[PDB]
């Protein structure tokens, strides 16, 4: 009938759905190095998702892993292990 | 008097396009002036959907075919009113085009109100201006929205006072009470200039044709 | 004494009804013109509503088959260095030239999308277009 | 009409009314075109079209308004709130 | 053989352009107020950029410049609003002057 | 109204001639200062407020500037900005804005 009329399709220009840094990666309570990347260096508090930039599922995984490691003796509770203070910062917190 | 009126006022009402307004524009001219660009899909108004061709990347596209038909009707109405010597008042609160619209009104011999529409200009006209004042016979809205994205109160007041309203309605406007809506882009300078030129040309053609017909009748 | 009930009917209907009733002795100047050339819709006030349930606006997004080619081009080569000139009605971007070449190559009878993409890129290089890949 | 004085209120109301005239279609110039059941706020009005000579069997206010409109024959029952303005 | 609205829309440069994000367009300064340059770039709206500190005098009415668009219109919905608030202007970055 | 002011001016001319005759001065070279002096002499008022004192001035000075009717017999107003309700003020603003646009395109003594 008419070829210039718009066609029914999806959005070919759709930008990729942003993926959390941990998407597709296995959060384990033994990976204390990864877990310490989401705990405050000074108080040991677990950062919120507004700081970690994690999806809900990965935030819950991180929290459960941190608690399990802390109670199983893999991770300090009140502070970040000093061995990991110099790891790639991935948290949107600026104390100074 | 009877024959004069019969052949002057009622003669043009027997022709589909007595003033030949269709030649004043084409869908290509409207496109070149960008009459087809609306606001984002979020600003869309529920009553402007019938005139929206679609949504190009969340940007509404106004159906220029419907715009052409509506613009034909609006220009024909405006030409007939100017021919009948009615008062045509151009309303627009777009400060970017206030000066232009005032100049167009002055040039075409009609009136303009591009300033803060004080309450009662139309509903309280007899008290404000005088008991014998003559209200506009047609109101042409170059921007049916005020400066806070609400419909111009003149639209409601004109509907109240039974003054027909031509009006350029964007995708975020409310054409319900505008007698002759012209779906189009009221924010681009090109589109506003095209609308001003079209209405000016139609009104001038109507007035000059009125003079010519009067001369033809009175010379015989 | 024109009725000031802008929510009840249209100006035409109210004027006509009052003239019929005899309230208005003379038809207003615009009545004959309106009756001769009425608008496509009678301007009756309607209160707007917000759609609530499964109802959605009937506006359909304007897509074309070449939009896929344009998206692939922008994802592979980026915007480019030739800035758009939207004032010229006949302006053609590098993406549009790629789209035309892809379309004619498809008309030639090639179906493979990646082969069409690479062939079009090479053809544009031959024509003298600096298709700079973003990655 | 609102006024500190009753006569000023009357004048205001009756002068404002003439600028807000409805036009009512009357069937054969004596009644309504069909039965009308409506609810305005909490007032229900059930009006029945009636033959010639039936009279106005309506709330007294409806009788007054119908005599003004030009309706001679109609039945009307007002249920719910009898608020005069509604 | 008269081009229809469908044909015009399909072949228009704006339609040929995809999303207006990070697209280099050619604007034209049509109005200047202090260091604010109002630039029209073929969209429905204009972009109000700031006179670059370098070559500032070179930016005058009618000058044709290069912009990197970020959004044809600046609109967004806010808590409780029924319709998008729009600032009636595009978003773009002024990359310099076209010569 | 204009006819009223014209009649007032005729009355003032006749009365000025009469006052000149009364004071014996030349009607031709009788000025407004002379009229004021003659009236002050003939109708001595000690009222402190000068405006409350007797005055025989030109109707132009006496009556306030009355705005003329702003439309013709056909009903059409004269000024295209009439319906603003402030046609003169907005005409002045429009002219100033036009001058400013032209200027932008091209390029202890008073208060
Ligand atoms: S972003 Fe993929 S699981 Fe969170
Ligand atoms: Mg608009």
Q: Please name the residue that has the structure tokens 């002759």.
A: B180
Mutate to test the interface with C, among B65, B179, B181 (most CBs of C within 10 A): B179
What is the best residue among A22, A27, A63 to mutate for testing ligand 1's pocket, by most ligand atoms within 8 Å of CB? A22
* DSSP H stretches of helix in E12-57: 13-16
Query: Kind and range of the H or E element at D43?
Result: strand D43-49
If you measure from the C-alpha of residue A20 to the centroid of ligand 1, how many angstroms do you get, rounded to a whole number? 5
Angle at which helices B64-83 and B189-219 cross, to 10°: 40
Helix (H, G, I), strand (E, B) or coil at C16: helix
Q: Are strands E36-40 and E46-50 parallel, antiparallel or unpaired?
A: antiparallel
Resolution (A): 3.0
Query: Kind and range of the H or E element at E5?
Result: helix E5-11
Q: What's phi and psi for B75, nearest 5 deg?
A: -65, -40
Yes or no: say if E22 and E70 are a contact pair by the CB < 8 Å rule. yes
Cα angle B190, B165, B36 (rounded to 5 degrees) comes to 30
* Numbered residues of chain C with Cβ closer than 8 Å to any chain D Cβ: 1-5, 8, 14, 17-18, 20-21, 23
How far is residue D23's CA from residue C8's CA, in Å, rounded to a whole number?
10
Which CB contacts under 8 angstroms, 24+ apart, belong to E51-59? E52/E94, E52/E96, E55/E96, E55/E97, E58/E97, E59/E29, E59/E32, E59/E97
The ligand placed nearest to the CA atom of residue A19 is 1
User: Based on the structure, what is the number of domains in chain A?
Assistant: 1
Helix (H, G, I), strand (E, B) or coil at A27: coil
DSSP count for chain A of H helices, then E strands: 3, 0
How far is residue D13's CA from residue C134's CA, in Å, rounded to a whole number?
76
List, in sequence order, every residue forming a beta bridge with E47; answer none if it has no partner: E39
A32, B45, B179, E26 from B51: Cα distances, Å:
60, 11, 15, 30
How far is residue B27's CA from residue B68's CA, in Å, rounded to a whole number?
6
How far is residue A6's CA from residue B60's CA, in Å, rounded to a whole number?
13
How far is residue D22's CA from residue D20's CA, in Å, rounded to a whole number?
7
Which amino acid residue places its CA nearest to atom 3 of ligand 1?
A23
Give the range of the structural domain holding residue A50, as residue numbers without chain letter.
2-96
- Ligand 1 pocket residues where CB is under 6 Å: A 19-20, 23, 55, 57-58
A16 touches chain C (CB under 8 A): no
CA of B94 vs chain E CAs: smallest distance (Å)? 11
The ligand placed nearest to the CA atom of residue B38 is 2
Q: What's phi and psi for C51, nearest 5 deg?
A: -65, 140
Yes or no: say if B40 and E46 are a contact pair by the CB < 8 Å rule. no
Q: What strands, in cross-sheet order, belong to the sheet with E23-33? A: E46-50, E36-40, E23-33, E64-71, E91-97
> For chain B, how are helix, strand and coil distributed in percent, rounded to 5?
45, 15, 35
If you measure from the C-alpha of residue D23 to the centroid of ligand 2, how many angstroms do you get, rounded to a whole number? 37
The one-character DSSP state at A48 is P
């Amino acid at each position: 009938s008419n070829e210039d009329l718009p066609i029914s399709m999806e959005n070919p220009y759709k930008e990729p759905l942003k993926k959390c840094i941990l998407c597709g990666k296995h959060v384990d309570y033994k990976n204390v190095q990864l877990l310490s990347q989401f705990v405050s260096p000074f108080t040991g508090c677990i950062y919120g998702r507004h700081i970690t930039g994690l999806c809900g599922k990965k935030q819950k995984e991180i929290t459960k892993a941190i608690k399990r490691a802390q109670i199983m003796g893999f991770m300090p509770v009140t502070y970040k292990d000093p061995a990991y203070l110099k790891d790639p910062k991935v948290c949107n917190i600026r104390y100074r | 008097s009877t024959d004069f009126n019969d052949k002057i006022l009622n003669e043009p009402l027997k022709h589909s396009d007595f003033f030949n307004v269709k030649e004043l524009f084409s869908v290509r001219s409207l496109f070149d002036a960008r009459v087809h660009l609306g606001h984002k899909a979020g600003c869309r108004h529920r009553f402007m959907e019938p005139y929206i061709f679609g949504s190009r990347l969340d940007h509404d596209i106004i159906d220029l075919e419907q715009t052409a038909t509506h613009l034909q009707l609006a220009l024909n109405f405006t030409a007939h009113m100017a021919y009948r010597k009615g008062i045509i008042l151009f309303i627009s609160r777009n400060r970017q085009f206030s000066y232009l619209i005032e100049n167009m009104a002055r040039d075409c011999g009609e009136y303009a109100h591009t300033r803060y529409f004080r309450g009662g200009m139309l509903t309280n006209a007899r008290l404000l201006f005088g008991p014998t004042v003559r209200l506009p016979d047609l109101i042409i809205f170059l921007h049916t929205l005020n400066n806070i994205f609400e419909p111009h109160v003149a639209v409601r007041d004109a509907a109240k006072m039974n003054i027909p309203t031509v009006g350029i309605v964007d995708t975020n406007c409310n054409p319900c009470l505008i007698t002759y809506p012209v779906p189009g882009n009221d924010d681009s300078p090109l589109a506003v200039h095209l609308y001003c030129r079209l209405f000016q040309t139609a009104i001038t053609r109507a007035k000059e044709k009125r003079q010519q017909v009067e001369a033809l009748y009175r010379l015989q | 004494a024109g009725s000031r009930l802008e929510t009840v009917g249209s100006i035409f209907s109210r004027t006509r009804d009052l003239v019929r009733a005899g309230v208005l002795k003379e038809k207003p100047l615009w009545f004959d013109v309106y009756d001769a050339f009425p608008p496509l819709r009678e301007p009756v006030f309607q209160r707007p509503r917000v759609r609530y349930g499964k109802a959605k606006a009937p506006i359909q997004d304007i897509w074309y088959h070449e939009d896929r080619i344009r998206a692939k081009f922008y994802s592979v080569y980026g915007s480019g260095q030739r800035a758009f000139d939207l004032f010229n009605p006949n302006f053609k971007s590098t993406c549009q030239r790629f789209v035309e070449k892809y379309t004619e190559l498809q008309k030639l009878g090639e179906t493979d999308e990646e082969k069409l993409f690479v062939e079009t890129g090479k053809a544009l290089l031959a024509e003298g277009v600096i298709l700079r890949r973003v990655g | 009409g609102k006024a500190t004085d009753r006569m000023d209120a009357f004048r205001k109301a009756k002068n404002r009314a003439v600028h807000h005239l409805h036009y009512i279609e009357r069937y054969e110039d004596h009644t309504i075109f069909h039965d009308i059941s409506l609810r305005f706020k909490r007032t229900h009005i059930k009006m029945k079209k009636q033959p010639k000579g039936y009279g106005l069997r309506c709330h007294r206010a409806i009788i007054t308004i119908c005599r003004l409109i030009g309706i001679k024959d109609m039945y009307a029952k007002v249920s719910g709130s009898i608020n005069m303005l509604s | 053989n008269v081009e229809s609205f469908a044909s015009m829309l399909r072949h228009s440069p704006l339609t040929q352009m995809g999303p207006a994000k990070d697209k280099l367009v050619i604007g034209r300064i049509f109005h200047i107020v202090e260091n604010d340059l109002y630039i029209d770039f073929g969209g429905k709206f204009h972009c109000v950029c700031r006179r670059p500190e370098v070559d500032g005098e070179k930016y005058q009415k009618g000058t044709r410049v290069r912009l990197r668009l970020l959004d044809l219109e600046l609109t967004s919905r806010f808590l409780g609003a029924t319709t998008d608030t729009t600032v009636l202007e595009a978003n773009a970055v002024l990359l310099g002057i076209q010569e | 109204t204009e006819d009223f002011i014209k009649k007032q001016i005729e009355e003032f001319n006749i009365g000025k001639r009469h006052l000149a005759n009364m004071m014996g001065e030349d009607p031709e070279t009788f000025t407004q200062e002379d009229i004021d002096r003659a009236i002050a002499y003939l109708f001595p008022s000690g009222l402190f407020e000068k405006r409350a004192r007797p005055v025989m001035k030109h109707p132009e000075q006496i009556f306030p500037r009355q705005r003329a009717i702003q439309w013709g017999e056909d009903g059409r107003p004269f000024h295209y900005l009439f319906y603003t309700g402030k046609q003169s003020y907005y005409s002045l603003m429009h002219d100033v804005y036009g001058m400013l646009l032209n200027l932008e395109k091209h390029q202890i003594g008073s208060r």
